[PDB]
């Protein structure tokens, strides 16, 4: 001024001394407003590199400490620090921006103020720390649904794909994390596929890093949701199935689970329904449905439910010993989904071929089904109903089913208000009465239990469902053409014949 001179302007000395005053009483004072904010702003605008650095470190430590929603004016200076050429300023400023980007509103506010291009150009510089931090920012910003569209259509997927291959593990973690967060919507997945990041992920399923391989597994699992993606992946990278199968035995459990789910998503299509079995995933799954951890059980039984759709797999599936663990899973009462998956699996297995039927029966499947045929959710009831409908079409199995007192389960199910349950149960009952050598159990179940077959016929004759009236009539004719006197005079009751209208 007049007595002395310094290299630093007086407003900035003001700022620095005030800042010193604040940094040792963080408790008491809010930093995203007022005094602290004007200090930091002044220090951002300054000529002096050291003061800028000081501001950046300040911002970084503050944002590290606590995260709240902040105004325009908290963000502008950090965005200006981002424009700096000083490496450590870049580091601190990015870290601060990400710590702020933890909070949801701040994500939208940051992206809307145009932070994307700074972050992107930071990522294309070859200082590793700023790569890690800037990519990290993109990662945290890509967790808001509003943003990921705008992030995708900005060209960030290209440096993300690039940096996902980094020899530095921190960078790779943040990068693959971002790529993962870009797989929550269909169009983001489309954009992600276009950038050619799929071969990178597929390759990085072999990463020894837990975080990286988990992120890539989850990302691929999320991509497999779309059918076009599934086809294109079946064409492009054939090795995927194998790698996922091997990942079903990973050190980390979340990886086993997510990989199993990815295999389910893939198993939605038939080519994969076969190729998973070729890759020898049946052992891992057998081990997994018998496991303790119920998410693994859920994933594995959903997966096997999808795989069992293809008939050609059937034998393999039975020869791998799946039946009794599945029947065991039927006892699980607390998870409706596991029940549904297991019973649906059984339905698939039975519906496919009539060859390993013997093994199916020997598994104790039918008795468990009979046991749950009334005490179970309508879902399970429905699948059990379909299953019975399937089994009652094997002429050689008819008398055995009848002998196992299957009518005691079928007859009440025909009261169910669910079209599938009642319908298929009635069809099964009808086909059990058709052309059997012995009508004993049919006779014994004429009135008992639950009003018996007589009650059944009487009711379904008066249904409006044309098909039901017809299965009633057809049942009657199948009983008349039974060449068994007793039953033919059981039809002498003409409740049936004046209602046979």
């Amino acid at each position: 001024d007049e007595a002395s001179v310094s290299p630093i302007a007086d407003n900035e000395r003001e700022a620095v001394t005030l800042l010193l005053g604040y940094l040792e009483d963080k408790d008491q004072l809010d930093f995203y407003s007022g005094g602290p904010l004007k200090a930091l702003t002044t220090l951002v605008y300054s000529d002096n590199l050291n003061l800028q650095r000081s501001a950046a470190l300040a911002f970084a430590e503050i944002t590290e400490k606590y995260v709240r929603q902040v105004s325009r004016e908290v963000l502008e200076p950090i965005l200006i620090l981002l424009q700096s050429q000083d490496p450590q300023i870049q580091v601190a400023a990015c870290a601060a921006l990400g710590n702020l980007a933890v909070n949801n509103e701040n994500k939208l506010l940051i992206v809307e103020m145009g932070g994307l291009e700074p972050l992107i150009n930071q990522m294309m510089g070859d200082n590793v720390e700023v790569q890690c931090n800037a990519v990290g920012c993109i990662t945290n910003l890509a967790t808001r649904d509003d943003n990921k569209h705008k992030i995708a259509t900005s060209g960030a997927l290209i440096p993300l794909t690039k940096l996902a291959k980094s020899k530095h593990i921190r960078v790779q973690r943040n990068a693959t994390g971002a790529l993962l967060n870009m797989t929550h919507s269909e169009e983001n997945r489309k954009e992600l596929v276009n950038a050619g990041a799929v071969p990178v992920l597929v390759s990085l399923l072999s990463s020894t890093d837990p975080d990286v391989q988990y992120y890539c597994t989850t990302a691929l699992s999320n991509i497999a949701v779309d059918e076009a993606n599934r086809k294109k992946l079946a064409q492009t990278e054939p090795r995927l199935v194998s790698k996922l199968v091997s990942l079903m035995d990973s050190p980390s459990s979340r990886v086993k689970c997510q990989a199993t789910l990815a295999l389910r998503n893939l198993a939605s299509d038939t080519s994969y329904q076969l190729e998973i079995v070729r890759a020898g995933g049946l052992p891992h799954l057998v081990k997994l449905i018998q496991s303790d951890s119920i998410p693994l059980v859920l994933a594995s039984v959903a997966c096997i439910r999808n795989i069992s759709i293809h008939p050609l797999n059937e034998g393999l599936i039975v020869d791998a010993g799946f039946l009794k663990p599945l029947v065991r899973l039927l006892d699980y009462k607390d998870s409706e989904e596991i029940q549904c998956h297991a019973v649906s699996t059984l339905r698939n297995l039975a519906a496919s071929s009539e060859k390993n039927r013997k093994e199916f029966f020997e598994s104790g499947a039918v008795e468990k089904c009979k046991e749950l045929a009334l005490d179970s959710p309508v879902s399970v009831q429905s699948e059990i109903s379909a299953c019975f409908a399937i089994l009652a079409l094997a002429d050689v199995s008819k008398l055995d089913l009848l002998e196992a007192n299957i009518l005691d389960a079928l007859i009440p199910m025909t009261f169910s208000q669910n079209q599938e349950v009642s319908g298929n149960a009635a069809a099964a009952l009808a086909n059990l009465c058709s052309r059997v050598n012995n009508y004993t159990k049919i006779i014994e179940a004429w009135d008992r239990p639950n009003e018996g077959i007589r009650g059944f016929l009487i009711r379904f004759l008066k249904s409006d469902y044309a098909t039901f009236e017809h299965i009633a009539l057809w049942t009657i004719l199948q009983l008349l053409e039974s060449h068994n006197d007793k039953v033919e005079d059981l039809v002498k009751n003409d409740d049936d014949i004046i209602n046979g209208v």
């Binding site: 870290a95 931090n133 990662t139 967790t143 994390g177 992120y215 989850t218 699992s221 998503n265 939605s268």
Partner: peptide
């Protein structure tokens, strides 16, 4: 031959995993 037919969408339909990645900094 008159088996009950499985609905085209009667399978375990694919889902998007709910996991969201968190960034780690300096």
């Amino acid at each position: 031959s008159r088996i009950p037919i499985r609905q085209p969408y009667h399978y375990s339909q694919p889902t998007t995993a709910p996991f969201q990645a968190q960034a780690k900094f300096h």
